[PDB]
């Protein structure tokens, strides 16, 4: 666990490749990508504030440091100061790792990381630097501030979480889960969306806590403009404890953002963008979520756009509670050639939903061709760059009108035999061959029928429903539905901690399930000597992932650090339970002599045993999701998600091997867009920590020290919570 918290100097780095796709765009489309890229870039910094207390200061310090001297320039100083190269290089790694993750905690696994190097040396490198001979006040006023927490390994700072265990800036420092829950119910009572809000608890002389629910908006509480949020800014009372709904969270940043978006408007290919954008403006201005909802609908009402875009507080993964969303944004061009091979899958999508283990009344009421694309990414702001996504994240819309499916094409081209660990010399062959092609399948299904399926049972205001009660029955029980989602209630608001992992698990499982279908393979051009292989490598990869997931599980807190990995582990356990020698984990020994493991998946037993385990599973998951049954959902999940040393596996003992063979993910550098006035051009870098540093130091040529200054301030304001 020494290296759990550091980034190896040899970490792989790749540059997102988009040129052609950016070229084909005529100037109008171009700028219409441009300003969105810049807005996204502007807003993505708030992730520093949403990640760690010391993050913003770090970003400022780094940006300045490299602004004064680039990697090659600062190198000479670093080395001259007595640093061996292998040290400085590790520093560069740490900076790039803070840039890509928009913080000092990994977007994947939510674990802290520090520069690998003696502190006393970096003190030198930073102080003796050119940047410190120019503004010697700042460098010391920062280095003294964020210096330690940069390298701090103290147990409680290692992972993310509420209470004494971890660190989260979504909440104040004194908040426990109890608070997230209380304030949660309080949010659903007034039906406030938890996405854009943060909870800050405070205490007076007597031990009575008061709660500040803050919203992210450009305009803090002041004489209002007469919007929704207007009437919503006031004091409330909840169960012997006070509540206050306020706004103005990360204001100036969103100033910049709304700017760039409005600059985006006039270039819109149709009314849809030009308006939905404005809606986003409203949302990031008033702090009104509904405003984002509207533009979220418009965004699907728009189809087949040359340039695809989106932004907001969206994915809820990194909230210890699981409600509040992490800000992001993206602008990417739609590739045509690879999209048709998806649109196909959309055309025949209708049928498949009815192949799911639950009756048509347990599934969404109509259907759609919401969209499925292949996007070459230009700008993706925030902590990470997903392979594919299904949004907007509002379920209600998913059933009523629709959603969208997004397969990013050029991220793939980036991520692709001794590192094949926990496989066999066969296998890995098939793995190398079919991993890439199958990837598209698993993603298409995950996105389309993963979250595309399912239906929520909600109680509308009046005692009526969104469905017909007397005709609906639970196949597991046989009774008539006794549970549902009532007004203001939502997936995250109920399942919370599990909601993300649970849902993801469902999606992936449907992935395998339908991956077993001849049709889908015919869509991806797989059959005969082909249709085997791909399927196999897919399932095999799923079980293997189930094994690797151990790394992201914290036994001491009995807590999982990720939704996807945890879900994968769960699926693995289900398969294991199916038994019949279909799956095996063997405590082998690697050629190096150290410990090791080999995952053994009998392929012949796939349909005879595994499938049943699956559709039973899916059946249960769905069933509990429709009625929104948390008791059964958890009991069924946290049981499956439990990690112990019981044989004939001993996951507690395996986890160590998983950590020894552990991998550290690579970094994806991103290109910029420079404004020439009447023209715009693209700025690309090398694939390396250095290149990425160069990408970030050039990211904000105009306001860079201004933005740095902001982050510094916005941090200093809330410094009293941690």
């Amino acid at each position: 666990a020494d290296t759990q918290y550091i980034l190896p100097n040899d970490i792989g780095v790749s540059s997102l490749d988009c040129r052609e796709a950016f070229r084909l765009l005529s100037p109008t489309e171009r700028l219409y990508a441009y300003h969105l890229s810049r807005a996204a870039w502007y807003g993505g910094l708030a992730v520093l504030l949403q990640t760690s207390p010391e993050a913003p200061y770090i970003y400022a310090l780094l940006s300045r440091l490299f602004r004064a001297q680039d990697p090659d320039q600062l190198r000479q100083h670093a080395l001259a100061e007595g640093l061996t190269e292998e040290e400085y290089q590790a520093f560069l790694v740490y900076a790039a790792g803070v840039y890509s993750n928009m913080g000092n905690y990994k977007s994947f696994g939510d674990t802290k990381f520090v520069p690998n190097l003696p502190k006393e040396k970096l003190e030198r490198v930073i102080l003796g630097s050119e940047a410190a001979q120019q503004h010697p006040e700042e460098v010391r006023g920062l280095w003294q501030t964020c210096g330690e927490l940069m390298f701090s390994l103290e147990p409680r700072l290692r992972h993310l979480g509420l209470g004494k265990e971890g660190i989260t800036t979504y909440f104040s420092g004194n908040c426990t889960m109890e608070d997230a829950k209380l304030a949660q119910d309080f949010l659903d009572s007034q039906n406030l969306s938890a996405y854009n809000t943060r909870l800050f608890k405070e205490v007076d002389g007597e031990g009575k806590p008061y709660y500040e629910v803050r919203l992210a908006s450009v305009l803090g509480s002041e004489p209002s403009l007469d919007s929704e949020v207007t009437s919503k800014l006031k004091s409330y009372e909840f169960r012997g404890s006070p509540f206050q709904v306020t706004r103005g969270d990360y204001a100036p940043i969103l100033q910049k953002v709304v700017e760039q978006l409005e600059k985006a408007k006039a270039y819109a290919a149709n009314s849809h963008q030009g308006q939905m954008l404005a809606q986003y403006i409203e949302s990031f201005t008033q702090g009104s979520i509904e405003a984002h909802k509207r533009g979220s609908r418009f965004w699907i009402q728009d189809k087949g756009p040359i340039v695809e875009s989106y932004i907001g507080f969206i994915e809820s993964y990194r909230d210890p509670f699981g409600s509040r969303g992490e800000f992001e944004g993206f602008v990417a061009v739609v590739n045509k050639a690879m999209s048709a091979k998806f649109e196909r899958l959309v055309a025949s999508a209708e049928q498949l939903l009815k192949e799911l283990p639950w009756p048509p009344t347990f599934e969404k009421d109509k259907f759609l061709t919401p969209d499925f694309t292949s996007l070459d990414v230009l700008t993706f702001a925030g902590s990470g760059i997903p392979a594919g996504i299904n949004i907007p994240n509002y379920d209600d819309l998913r059933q009523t009108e629709g959603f969208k499916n997004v397969s990013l094409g050029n991220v793939l081209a980036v991520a692709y035999r001794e590192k094949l660990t926990f496989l066999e010399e066969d296998d890995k062959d098939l793995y190398i061959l079919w991993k890439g092609p199958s990837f598209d399948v698993q993603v298409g299904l995950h996105a389309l029928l993963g979250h595309g399926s399912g239906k929520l049972f909600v109680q509308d205001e009046k005692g009526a429903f969104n469905f017909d009660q007397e005709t609906v029955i639970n196949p597991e029980t046989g009774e008539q539905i006794q549970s549902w989602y009532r007004s203001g209630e939502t997936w995250d608001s109920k399942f919370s901690t599990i909601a993300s992992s649970y849902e993801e698990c469902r999606a992936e499982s449907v992935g395998l399930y339908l991956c077993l279908h001849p049709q889908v393979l015919e869509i991806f051009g797989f059959e005969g000597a082909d249709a085997e292989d791909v399927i196999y490598v897919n399932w095999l990869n799923m079980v293997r992932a189930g094994l690797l997931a151990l790394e992201f599980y914290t036994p001491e807190a009995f807590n999982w650090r990720q939704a996807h990995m945890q879900a994968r582990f769960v699926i693995l356990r289900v398969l294991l339970e199916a038994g019949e020698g279909l799956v095996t984990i063997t405590p082998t020994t690697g050629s190096d002599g150290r410990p090791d493991a080999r995952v053994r998946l009998d392929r012949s037993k796939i349909r005879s045993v595994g499938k049943p385990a699956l559709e039973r599973f899916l059946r249960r998951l769905q069933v509990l999701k429709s009625t929104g049954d948390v008791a059964g959902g958890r009991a069924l999940y946290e049981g499956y998600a439990t990690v112990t040393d019981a044989p004939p596996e001993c996951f507690l003992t395996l986890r160590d091997t998983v950590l020894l063979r552990k991998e550290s993910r690579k970094l994806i550098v991103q290109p910029n867009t420079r404004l020439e006035g009447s023209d715009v051009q693209l700025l690309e870098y090398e694939a390396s920590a250095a290149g990425l540093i160069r990408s970030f130091s050039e990211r904000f040529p105009e306001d860079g020290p201004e933005l740095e200054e902001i982050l510094t301030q916005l941090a200093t304001a809330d410094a009293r919570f941690w």
Partner: peptide
Amino acid sequence: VVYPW
């Protein structure tokens, strides 16, 4: 909602 690489 995200499916990672």
